[PDB]
Symmetry: D2
Subunit: 266 residues, 4 copies
C-alpha cells in the first residue's frame, strides 16, 4: 500500500500493553507444563483462553478453576495436532464459542529420539515432523483466515534450543530438524501475514516439565552447558508468552526468543 503504513496508537502504560482484555487465545499442549503456565499469564492479563489438549486428564475441571481464579472465560478442547481436521475443527470451535481469536500458541510437541540409520523407523521420522512441524502449519493455515478478517493477530510457536543446537548425548536429528523448520516457517509467516498479524517463536532450553531432561546423563550435560546450572522453571516463560501475545510487542515480528539459561552460549 502507501508508505509509511500507520503507526498504531499505543498505550502510555507499559502494563496496559500487556493486557489481554477482550482478546481470545488458543493454546495447544494446554494441559502441559509450558502451555498451562502461558494460559495462567494470559488469564491474569484478562484474556480468555481456549486450552487445547489430547490426552491430559481433568481439563474441564482445570479450565473451570483457571476461569474462576482470574474472572475470564476458559474452555477446553480436544485436539490431535497431527490431524489437520482436528486442528481446524478446534480453531473453528474456539472462533464460534468465543466470537474471535487473537492469539494461537502452537505449543504441543514431541517426537521420537534416535540416531539416523536403518534402525530408525520411517514412521518415527514422520510422527516427529507431524507433531512439531505439520501441526504448526495446520494451525497457521486456518488462523490465517481469522487473523486476516480481524485485521490483527498473534501467532506463537514454542520451539526449542534444539532448533539451533544439537542435543547430546541422545541424538535426535528428527526433532531438531522439525523445530528448526518451525523457527524459519514462522519467520516466513511473519512476512507472509505482515498486513494482518505478527508471528514469533519462543525457544526454551531445558525446563522442569515431563519433556525436560530424561535422565542423569542429560542433566549432567545441562549443568555444564546452562551457565545458570539448572533447568528452567515454567514461571520463567510466563512473561515471554504474554509479551508476544499482547500489544507489548507490536514491532516484534519474525523473532525467536531464546530462554535457555545460557545453554547455547558455549
Amino acid at each position: 500500500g502507501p508508505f509509511p503504513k500507520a503507526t498504531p496508537q499505543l498505550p502510555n502504560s507499559v502494563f496496559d500493553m500487556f493486557s489481554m482484555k477482550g482478546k481470545v487465545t488458543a493454546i495447544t499442549g494446554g494441559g502441559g507444563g509450558i502451555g498451562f503456565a502461558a494460559a495462567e499469564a494470559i488469564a491474569e492479563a484478562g484474556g480468555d483462553v481456549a486450552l487445547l489438549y489430547r490426552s491430559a486428564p481433568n481439563m474441564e475441571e482445570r479450565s473451570a478453576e483457571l476461569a474462576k481464579r482470574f474472572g475470564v472465560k476458559v474452555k477446553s478442547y480436544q485436539c490431535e495436532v497431527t490431524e489437520h481436521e482436528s486442528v481446524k475443527q478446534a480453531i473453528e470451535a474456539v472462533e464460534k464459542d468465543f466470537g474471535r481469536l487473537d492469539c494461537y500458541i502452537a505449543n504441543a510437541g514431541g517426537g521420537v529420539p534416535g540416531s539416523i540409520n536403518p534402525d530408525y523407523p520411517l514412521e518415527a521420522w514422520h510422527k516427529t515432523q507431524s507433531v512439531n512441524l505439520h501441526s504448526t502449519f495446520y494451525a497457521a493455515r486456518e488462523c490465517a483466515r481469522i487473523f486476516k478478517a480481524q485485521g490483527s493477530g498473534s501467532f506463537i510457536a514454542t520451539t526449542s534450543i534444539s532448533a539451533r543446537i544439537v542435543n547430546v548425548p541422545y541424538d535426535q536429528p528428527a526433532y531438531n530438524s522439525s523445530k528448526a523448520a518451525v523457527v524459519h516457517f514462522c519467520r516466513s509467516l511473519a512476512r507472509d501475514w505482515r498486513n494482518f498479524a505478527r508471528v514469533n517463536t519462543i525457544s526454551p532450553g531445558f525446563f522442569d516439565t515431563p519433556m525436560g531432561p530424561s535422565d542423569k546423563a542429560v542433566e549432567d550435560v545441562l549443568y555444564q552447558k546452562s551457565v545458570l546450572g539448572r533447568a528452567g522453571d515454567v514461571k520463567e516463560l510466563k512473561a515471554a508468552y504474554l509479551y508476544l501475545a499482547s500489544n507489548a510487542s507490536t514491532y516484534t515480528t519474525g523473532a525467536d526468543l531464546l530462554i535457555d539459561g545460557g545453554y547455547c552460549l558455549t
Copy 2:
C-alpha cells in the same frame, strides 16, 4: 557447585515478576528516545532510575518530572561514555546515592557513517568503536564488582539490526561492527557473570528518534524491508527493557531481543 543450582523464587503473578520496586536502574542515553522510554517503563514498574546523559538539556527537570509521575527516585548524572573515568564515576555516584545497582542499560550510541577507504578518518573509526563498544566494556567492568557483591544483576545493551545486517544505502562498517562486537561481548559476559548476573541485548530496527532513518533514501529502504512498512515508536521497546530488567526473565541470559518490524526477515 553443587548442581542443580537453586531455582530463584518468583511470584505467582506474571505482573509481579516485572516489578522494579527496591531496584535501581542506570540508563545511558537517558535523555534520548529509546533511553527515556526505557526509564518510563522501569519507573512505572516502581523502579528507581539514574538517568545518564552527556549533552541533553533540562535533565534535572525531566528527572524530577519522571520521579513525581511514578513516585520513584530519579536523578541525572553527567556521563561521557567514551571515557572510562566518566563511566566509572557515574556508576559509583549512583551506587553511593541509591545504595545499589540492579540494572545497567548501556544505551548510549552513535558513530560516523562512511565507506571504508583512505577518506575514512582513523578517528571516525575509533570514535564509533568508543561510543558503542568501549563504553559498554567500561560499564560492564565496573558493574561486575557491584553485581558480584549483590549476587544479582541485569546488564542490558542496546545493540541494533546493524549488528546482524548491513545498512544501505549509506555504508557504515564501523557502526555495524561495533554493535556486532557488543552483542557477542554481552553473550561472553553472560557466561563470565554466571554466578551473579544476567546479560542480554535488545536489537532495535529503525525507530522514530534522532538516530532513525537519515533521509528519504533510508526511509524508502525501511518501508520495503520492514514487513510492517514503518519505523518503530519507542513505546514498543518499553516492555522489552522491563522484561530483561526484571524477574520476568530469570532464565533469559545471553539473548538478543530482535525488535525490528521484520527488517531482518528480508
Copy 3:
C-alpha cells in the same frame, strides 16, 4: 575410544587434497544445473560419479559423455527422492555397481510456492517437505550404514538462502521451512555420524538454472539484494562441492557454505 582422536594423514599438496581418485560420489538432481556442475567438478578431480535423476532426458548418453571426457566411471540411476524405497534402491545399486560410496549429494529439490492460507493445499505442503526434507532423511538413513561400514564418508545437502532468509515477492513458507529443516538436520547428523563421516550443506543464492528467478519481479529483488547485482552461474558452486566431497575439508563438519553473491547481507 580415547582422546585425542587421531589426526588424518594428509598430503602436503593442497591440490592433492581435492582428488576424488578412488572415491565414488552419488548426486541427486544429477541432470540438473547445480547437480551436473558438481558432477563435472568431481569427475575432473578423478572421482567416479553416480548420476541420480527422475525425469531428466538423455541421462545415459550424458553419463557416457562425462565418463569419456574425464576418464572416470559415470552411471545414471533413476531415483524418485520423495519415496524411501527408490532412494534406498538407488544407493544400494551404486554401492553394488561401484563397490563403495564415499560421498552423497542430496541435491534434488523443489516445492510449491504460495502464501499460507486455506487456498494452500495440504498436499502442496507435504509435497514440498517430501522433495527437500524427507528425501534428505531417506538418503541419510541408508548412507549411515555404508559410511560407518567404511569408517569414512561425506554427506552434502544443497540447501538455499531460503533456509535463513524469506523470499520475496512470492511467499513460500513451505519451501523455506523445508530447507531450514535440512540445514539443521545435517548439523544433527554431523554430531550423530561423528565417528564415521562428515556432514555439511551448501546454501546457494539465486543461480541461472530452471530453479532460478521465476520472473522479472524476482529478478528486480535479486539485483537489489545480491551485492554483485546478478544471479550466480553454476560454475561458481563447483569448487564448494569438490571442497566438501574431498580431503580438502577434513576438519569441516556441521558447516553451511553460503554462496549467494551477498543476498543475505542486507
Copy 4:
C-alpha cells in the same frame, strides 16, 4: 540500470578456478601456523606471497625457501598490525615490490584473556581490540584503494569460533567480541566494496598452533565439544584459504567459513 551486471570470466575447469598465477597475496601472521599454511596453499596454486610478520625469526630465509619451493615470488615485511602506519607501510611496500595486491589475509591475532571486572586492565581490552579488530580496519582502509584501481580483490580475515561461541573455562570476552566485530565488519565491507572486491572470513576452531588449547582443561573441553575429538591440523585450513583467495569463489561474498570439527554444534 546497469542490471544485470555481467558474470565474470569463469574457467570451465574447477582446478583452473583455484589458480593464483599472476596474483599477489599479503598475509599478516605470515610466520605463524595458519598464516604460513595459507601461504603454502597459495604458493602451490602459483600465487606470489608477501609474508607479513612482527617478531617471527628467520623470515627472509623462510620467504626465500617458500619461493624456491614453488617457483613463485615470496617476500617478507615487518608489520605491527596494531599501528595503522605500519599496516599501510607494509601494504604500500608490497604493492610496489609485487606490482599488485589481489588478496589480503588479515590473519594476525592475539589478545589477553580474563574475566571482565576491575582486575581486567583497560590496556588489555584495547590491546585485544587493536590486534584483532583495528588491525583489520587498518588493512581494509588501504586495500580499498588498490582493489578499486584493479577492479578486483579478495579480502579475508581469520576470525574464530570465538566470534560465535563463548570460550570455556577461561573467560575472554575481549577476544570473543573483537572476533565477532571482525566477522560483521567483513560482512559490511562485502557490501561496501561490492563493485571491486569480495570479502569473507574463515572461523577456525581449535588448531594445533601456539594459539591452540592453552592447557589440558581447554583440551578436555575441546575433546568433548568438537565431534571429531581432536584439534585441527593447519593443513585442514589450506584449501579454504585458497578457495576464498581465488576464482573458485566468485559468487561467495560476506560468508563465514566455519572450520571447527563441529565444536559449535552442541
